[PDB]
Amino acid sequence: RFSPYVFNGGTILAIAGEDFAIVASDTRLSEGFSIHTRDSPKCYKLTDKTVIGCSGFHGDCLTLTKIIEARLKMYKHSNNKAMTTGAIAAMLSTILYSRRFFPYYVYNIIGGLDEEGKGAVYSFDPVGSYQRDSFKAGGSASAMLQPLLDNQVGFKNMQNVEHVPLSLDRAMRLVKDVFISAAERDVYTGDALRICIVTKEGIREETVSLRKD
Amino acid sequence: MEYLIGIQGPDYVLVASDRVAASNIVQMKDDHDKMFKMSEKILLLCVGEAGDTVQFAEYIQKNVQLYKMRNGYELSPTAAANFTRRNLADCLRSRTPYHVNLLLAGYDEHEGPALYYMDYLAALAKAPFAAHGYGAFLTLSILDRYYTPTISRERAVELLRKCLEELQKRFILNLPTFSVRIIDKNGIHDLDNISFPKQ
Amino acid sequence: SIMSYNGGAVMAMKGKNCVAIAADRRFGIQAQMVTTDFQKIFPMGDRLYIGLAGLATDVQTVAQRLKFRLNLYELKEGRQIKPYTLMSMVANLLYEKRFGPYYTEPVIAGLDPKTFKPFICSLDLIGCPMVTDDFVVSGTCAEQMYGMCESLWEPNMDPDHLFETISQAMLNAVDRDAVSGMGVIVHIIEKDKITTRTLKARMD
Amino acid sequence: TTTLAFKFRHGVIVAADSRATAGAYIASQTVKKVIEINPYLLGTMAGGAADCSFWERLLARQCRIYELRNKERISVAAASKLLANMVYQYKGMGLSMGTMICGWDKRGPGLYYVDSEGNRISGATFSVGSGSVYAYGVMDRGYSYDLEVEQAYDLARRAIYQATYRDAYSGGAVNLYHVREDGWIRVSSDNVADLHEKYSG
Amino acid sequence: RYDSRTTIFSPEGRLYQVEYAMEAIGHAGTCLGILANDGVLLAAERRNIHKLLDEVFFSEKIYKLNEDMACSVAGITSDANVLTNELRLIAQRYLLQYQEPIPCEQLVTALCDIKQAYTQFGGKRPFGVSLLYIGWDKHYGFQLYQSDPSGNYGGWKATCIGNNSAAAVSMLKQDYKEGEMTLKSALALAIKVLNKTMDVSKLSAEKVEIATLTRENGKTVIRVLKQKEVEQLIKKHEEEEAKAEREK
Amino acid sequence: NQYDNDVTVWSPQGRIHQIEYAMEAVKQGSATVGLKSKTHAVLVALKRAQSELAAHQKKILHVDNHIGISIAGLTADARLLCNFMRQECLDSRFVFDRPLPVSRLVSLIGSKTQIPTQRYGRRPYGVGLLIAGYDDMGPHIFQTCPSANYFDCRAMSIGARSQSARTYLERHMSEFMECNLNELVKHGLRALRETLPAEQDLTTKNVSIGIVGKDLEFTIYDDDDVSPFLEGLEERPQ
Amino acid sequence: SYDRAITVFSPDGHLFQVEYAQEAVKKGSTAVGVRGRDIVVLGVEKKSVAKLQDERTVRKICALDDNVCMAFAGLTADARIVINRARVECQSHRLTVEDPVTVEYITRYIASLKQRYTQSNGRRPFGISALIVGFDFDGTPRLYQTDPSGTYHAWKANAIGRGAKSVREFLEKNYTDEAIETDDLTIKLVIKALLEVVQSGGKNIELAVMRRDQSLKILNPEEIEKYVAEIEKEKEENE
Amino acid sequence: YDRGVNTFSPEGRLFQVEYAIEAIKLGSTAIGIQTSEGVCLAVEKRITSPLMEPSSIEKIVEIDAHIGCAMSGLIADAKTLIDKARVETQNHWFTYNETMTVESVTQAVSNLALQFGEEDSRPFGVALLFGGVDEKGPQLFHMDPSGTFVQCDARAIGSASEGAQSSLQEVYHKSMTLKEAIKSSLIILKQVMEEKLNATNIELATVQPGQNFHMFTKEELEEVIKDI
């Protein structure tokens, strides 16, 4: 009989900097044991200071993206201003709970700048609970990225090591190293790496190739 | 699971319940009350599900008080008992069935004292004594042994104490304390609490 | 089953100029009794009774809904109700719950309001009327009640022997049943008076 | 998941862990399981993340309107009752909620317990969670109504530590709040690994 | 003017449509109930007693309603049949709910809330019907009540109808009894009051109606007493006139 | 005079007076002028003060990234049509993922305003909408009316004493197709200064200018950015 | 000229059909009420029994809940709907929120129910005014009042009915800033206030008090006759 | 044609809503002034009786903990507008974790006042003054029964409205302070009311950026009046 859900894969990474935010994802879209395309990024520029990532079931990712982009315009003409980073995370929690008994199969991470100019990363669940974190990794390779970033960013289980804040250039090579190691052991990850950098001067993009198998 | 008792006298109604609000292993509350003063001569005992006990019995509680304020006088215990049966049976073949077990205790100025039994399928009865829960099995044949239709209110408390010591002996649950009421021509009087030094 | 949740037995029997009806007294859950004074025969006007058996919820429910419609009928019309008319009234009430049905099987017994003519009938749980000339039975212990009435019934019987026949039919059949008993009440009515007797039965 | 709450002479003590998992996978270690409803009310999170997050935020939406319409704060028994009726309409549909309500009232302290099943009870001591049953015994061995303020801080901090030791679904940090007559106050937030060097030493 | 619908006040509190309905009942029949210990009674008048009718019901003004209550009627007959079928349907809804008869006051207020509700809602009419109440209950015994088109009511011990027979209320006070209120003492008072108000002399039995309600062995029988015993009740009062002229 | 009461009632001359009266509500509002080139469509409005120190009431309001409208008439019917206007613009973005063609959006307005001009129970919308936009075939200048007619045009002025603005537009409409924004804007606001009494001048605090372009999103300039537009002007020949 | 509608305005901004509803209040019997230290009291006048009816069905003083009272004016039909509706709300409040009902909450329900009942055409407004007296909200005595426009409002001493202007002017020169303690003194203030009745028969006063802890205490015409005697005892000092 | 909200004139405009503007005129006066230090606000009570309890007459209500209010005209329609204005600020915080701006409060309020005959009743009879300090600093706004919404720097409405405006335009300038604007406001009040100005005829309400509390003055008001 008909089943309404299917898994598509994907891996989303976000790191809250001191005055920046980095959002990274792969561009591989798959289903079962087939590859649909090798060019399908998960980054979405909502505003000039907020980028969202959407993994999971791809049909709900296309729907939920267009609902949020409609409500950005509905906020603005009612208030003569744009939404903040924390306002979007409060709005998204009500949208995800609004279909509590038929849930979206989407994992969400919002990264961007606050009103003070600092980094902010909000992680989500498919029902709508959230919290502010410093770094999260969502998607199929989520278990292969969280223990390594605890060592490098959080400095957990380390002795006699000072807590220097992560610079921008050091954070770029940490993102480029974790996706090489994750594409080796995971099958839902590869073919590119789209990286979005959110600073006070706009949004930069950068693409790094991976292995194509 | 929890226990009720319904000893009826010639001019009094002796009722008692337990004080346990357990959660599946633990005992969260040991002074819980299951006694609802519907009016100045009618009590209410309720045993059932988690939310269905509080939601339904307070719906009856705040509907008999409406009859008192609007008509100036008080319901009889028979008419109050036969209104509670109407609300289960009407709300039984629906999406929200209430799963509670009740017994009603009332005194009338013209009919004397009265006791009514209630199933979770809304079946009325007029009993000289009644009980509920798993402890209803072990205790009612004791109460069937020594009952007399002309019994004093002092022997009924002694018969109630005989009825609860065997529930202390051969029943697996703990049940340490038991609150006791009494209803007469003067109203609802609160008797002393019943506890058990086991060994 | 759902019918076997509380038990019950209702019997009616036609005589010469009179008619009798009897039922049990036991109220109880599946194996545990509660009381021995549960009413299962309800007067609906003079010289005309009704008996109910089945689920104890629908016994008390239908007997109040039928009383709701009877009093509205006997005020729009100054006359009383005919026994054929009540059978059509009950069959309408059960068929409205075609797919949500009440779990009872009514038995109607009574005399004609003008003549002395008796009337007995029984219905199903969805309202199939069935009139007879000798007896109707309903309840859980139905098969035991057919065995007693097919052998003891006589066509033209005085109220003396009609009482003695329905007494031996109820006592010997309900004592074979397990979930029915604890006392038997018998109503025997006629043109002049109504006689109600209770029998000495086994209380086990 | 392990929360507890107990009231005494000087108000109410609230304590909880900070670990939220997903199957056998730990999601985070910094989950704030005590939801700050008002400056005079506190709520907990026990069973279901978004279920305890949404309906207590909806309760905080309701208590503010009650303050504006009546020029007076809401009572503790009122807010626990309003939460019980909202969840009861979704009975059987599959909610999970086992929160607690704390706060000072005109009658004094206040402590109620609300389930998703429909249980609304008062009391003096409570402990909710998967590792809740490990916390009842160590609390009741040291509980008294006439405990000191610094003594009550060490009792709840001990009881969360013994619960996170035996349970696998409990760990992270130990939050600790204190409800005073005027309003609640944040006491501290200590790591479990820091307490292990303190308690075992 | 202000003779529009009933949902508009006059310049000063004088709902004119309600006042027009409360004056319409004076040009109608005549009904009265009297005091009684251990009983109560009603008395009515047969209008248009032309010799080509049947009277197959033999009860026209009086409608037995629950089991121990009846009522008179006065006003527009089109609205009369609506209220009686509604009022009987109230008492059986109460009886289905509590399995006890309706205690004779909150039956009246149940109708009076319906009769009021047509004075506030729409462009229609109020009920142009006033009517009486007799009954017995557990709490107060024998009772009398008086309906109005506005939904107002009130208990009484003896009352009647207005512009037809408003002079009878002066007679009920002048010949008032209190305590000595047996049924035979009240039936003699009833035929005397209907003698003057019904302007047709000598009081033929086919123009009147008498209904009683007693309390017998806990059954509360209701009597609509037949025309044969009206005859010996009238001729008793005709004899008392010939006895009263001995003082002259 | 008995025919002058409802929208339903026809006249013995064949003219419904209630539609004829809603035209008069348009003349109560202030003047506003819209025009276009081959590449750029600019509409310029005129603010009106309420008191000596309250803020001036705004006229031009953003709708979409390629559509902006002006206003003249009732403010009650203004925001009621705006909420209908914004809902239709984002439905094509949500369904078709394209911006609306401007010519077919206005046909939805004439279907919207037709029902309350025929059925009893709702007055006609007293409103004077000027519409500028960009479909795939260049700029457009549209006007509407409470008689539910919509007129495509290359220049239009409606509102109080706007006849003198129309005379300036007719003798300069040959110059509008070629000139760019540095004078196309101040071709337009030379038409507003004849809709003024001859003693006061168009200042920086009482005028709004909205520009939507072929490569330019619709942008509203007011009270600070009007000064690069009001520079380089002559006075009135007095 | 133009009234005949509750939705139209006057050329000087009035609602005459709302203002005509207050004219129907002035045909009612007067009822006064004061608050005191602990005991609140309210009394009514103009009983006027008519020799042939029972007087327990003409009652003007009712209780909504266990610790709140009610006195009204206007016409008797519209009061019965408002009383019967307010008994439901002061009971359904207790079911949804487990507190007892404050005296302030029930007056906002009566005013708001009379509010929306004025707005829509074809709905004749209530021609009654009410006095809500209750020392319920945590030992604090209060009394409010209503209006046919739907404006709940708080006084400290009140008079309504046919002749309220004389009594309200009387109480301003009589209600001392000295709080009337020894609550029979406060009851004697009402009997002195109700002494300016339309006829002042003496036996036409039905005073009802409440000691803020018990239920309603309807006074008998023997205790009230004793308070009428001591009012004449203080009147002997004029000579 | 002057008794219907569904009927135009040969000239233009209602009369119906024009008659609703006239209902404001028989109210009480109220003055609000916007200043860079915050927004002060004053009103006149017109207490009728000494037995009449004074704090049951509201003219300043608290919409939110950084937004005040003022009213005139019909009291019955005012309590309807205050109700949703408290709810719409509360629904916005529920779904955005932020405070609704003072301008966008009245956007929600004006969306229902223009619904009197525009559904599928009568217009309201009350003007409102909204003062508050949002992220754009202190603000002061004004509305009407016709839904026409505008920002004002210093506004006086109610009875004595036009007579206050002429004197109020004289002394206002941009570089005011808050304590200067408070004593400047009630010089106007004692010139436009008929009773002698004391501590019981008026009441004040202020709002500051760092002092979002205290939209009321409690007897401090006696200090301001004694130094007039």
UniProtKB/Swiss-Prot annotation, chain A:
Residues bearing the modification Phosphotyrosine: 122
Chain positions with Phosphoserine modification: 34, 40, 134
Transmembrane segment boundaries: none
Glycosylation sites per record: 30, 181
Keywords: Acetylation, Cytoplasm, Deafness, Glycoprotein, Host-virus interaction, Intellectual disability, Nucleus, Phosphoprotein, Proteasome
Keyword match Protein transport: no
Cellular component, GO annotation: cytoplasm; cytosol; extracellular exosome; extracellular region; ficolin-1-rich granule lumen; nucleoplasm; nucleus; proteasome complex
Keyword Methyltransferase set for record: no
N6-acetyllysine modification, residue list: 176
Entry's Gene Ontology BP terms: proteasome-mediated ubiquitin-dependent protein catabolic process; proteolysis involved in protein catabolic process
Compartments reported by the entry: Cytoplasm; Nucleus
Chief place of localization: cytoplasm
CDD domains on file: proteasome_beta_type_1
Function in brief: Non-catalytic component of the 20S core proteasome complex involved in the proteolytic degradation of most intracellular proteins. This complex plays numerous essential roles within the cell by associating with different regulatory particles. Associated with two 19S regulatory particles, forms the 26S proteasome and thus participates in the ATP-dependent degradation of ubiquitinated proteins.
Similarity section: Belongs to the peptidase T1B family.
Implicated disorder: Neurodevelopmental disorder with microcephaly, hypotonia, and absent language: An autosomal recessive disorder characterized by microcephaly, intellectual disability with absent speech, severe developmental delay, short stature, and hypotonia. Affected individuals also manifest aggressive behavior and have hearing loss.
Protein name as catalogued: Proteasome subunit beta type-1
From Swiss-Prot, chain B:
GO BP, one annotated term: proteasome-mediated ubiquitin-dependent protein catabolic process
Pfam family, one: Proteasome
Keyword field: Acetylation, Cytoplasm, Host-virus interaction, Nucleus, Proteasome
Residue positions, PTM N-acetylmethionine: 1
Subcellular location per the Swiss-Prot or TrEMBL entry: Cytoplasm; Nucleus
Induction: Up-regulated in ovarian cancer cell lines.
One GO term describing the cellular component: nucleoplasm
Keyword field contains Nucleus: yes
The keyword rRNA-binding is annotated on this UniProt entry: no
InterPro entries: Ntn_hydrolases_N (IPR029055), Proteasome_beta2 (IPR035206), Proteasome_bsu_CS (IPR016050), Proteasome_sua/b (IPR001353), Proteasome_suB-type (IPR023333)
Subunit composition and interactions: The 26S proteasome consists of a 20S proteasome core and two 19S regulatory subunits. The 20S proteasome core is a barrel-shaped complex made of 28 subunits that are arranged in four stacked rings. The two outer rings are each formed by seven alpha subunits, and the two inner rings are formed by seven beta subunits. The proteolytic activity is exerted by three beta-subunits PSMB5, PSMB6 and PSMB7.
Family: Belongs to the peptidase T1B family.
Annotated function: Non-catalytic component of the 20S core proteasome complex involved in the proteolytic degradation of most intracellular proteins. This complex plays numerous essential roles within the cell by associating with different regulatory particles. Associated with two 19S regulatory particles, forms the 26S proteasome and thus participates in the ATP-dependent degradation of ubiquitinated proteins.
Name listed for the protein in its UniProt record: Proteasome subunit beta type-2
The species this protein was found in: Homo sapiens
UniProtKB/Swiss-Prot annotation, chain G:
Full protein name: Proteasome subunit alpha type-7
Sequence similarity: Belongs to the peptidase T1A family.
Statement: the UniProt record of this protein carries the keyword Zinc-finger: no
Gene that this sequence comes from: PSMA7
Assembly, per entry: The 26S proteasome consists of a 20S proteasome core and two 19S regulatory subunits. The 20S proteasome core is a barrel-shaped complex made of 28 subunits that are arranged in four stacked rings. The two outer rings are each formed by seven alpha subunits, and the two inner rings are formed by seven beta subunits. The proteolytic activity is exerted by three beta-subunits PSMB5, PSMB6 and PSMB7. PSMA7 interacts directly with the PSMG1-PSMG2 heterodimer which promotes 20S proteasome assembly. Interacts with HIF1A. Interacts with RAB7A. Interacts with PRKN. Interacts with ABL1 and ABL2.
PROSITE patterns linked: PROTEASOME_ALPHA_1, PROTEASOME_ALPHA_2
Function summary: Component of the 20S core proteasome complex involved in the proteolytic degradation of most intracellular proteins. This complex plays numerous essential roles within the cell by associating with different regulatory particles. Associated with two 19S regulatory particles, forms the 26S proteasome and thus participates in the ATP-dependent degradation of ubiquitinated proteins.
Pfam families in alphabetical order: Proteasome (PF00227), Proteasome_A_N (PF10584)
Coiled-coil residue windows: none
Biological process annotations from GO: proteasome-mediated ubiquitin-dependent protein catabolic process
Glycosylation sites: 129
GO molecular function, one term: identical protein binding
Highest taxon above the source species: Eukaryota
Phosphotyrosine: residues carrying this PTM: 152
Modified positions (N6-acetyllysine) in chain numbering: 226
Swiss-Prot record, chain H:
Tissue expression summary: Expressed in fetal brain (at protein level).
Source organism of this protein record: Homo sapiens (Human)
Positions of modified residues (Phosphoserine): 9, 49, 56
Entry GO CC: cytoplasm; cytosol; extracellular exosome; extracellular region; ficolin-1-rich granule lumen; nucleoplasm; nucleus; proteasome complex
Gene Ontology annotations of biological process type: proteasome-mediated ubiquitin-dependent protein catabolic process
NCBIfam families: PRK03996.1 (NF003075)
Role summary: Component of the 20S core proteasome complex involved in the proteolytic degradation of most intracellular proteins. This complex plays numerous essential roles within the cell by associating with different regulatory particles. Associated with two 19S regulatory particles, forms the 26S proteasome and thus participates in the ATP-dependent degradation of ubiquitinated proteins.
Keyword tags: Acetylation, Cytoplasm, Glycoprotein, Nucleus, Phosphoprotein, Proteasome
SUPFAM superfamilies cross-referenced by the UniProt entry: N-terminal nucleophile aminohydrolases (Ntn hydrolases)
SMART domains membership: Proteasome_A_N
Protein name: Proteasome subunit alpha type-5
Primary localization: cytoplasm
Residues recorded with modification Phosphothreonine: 48
Domain of life: Eukaryota
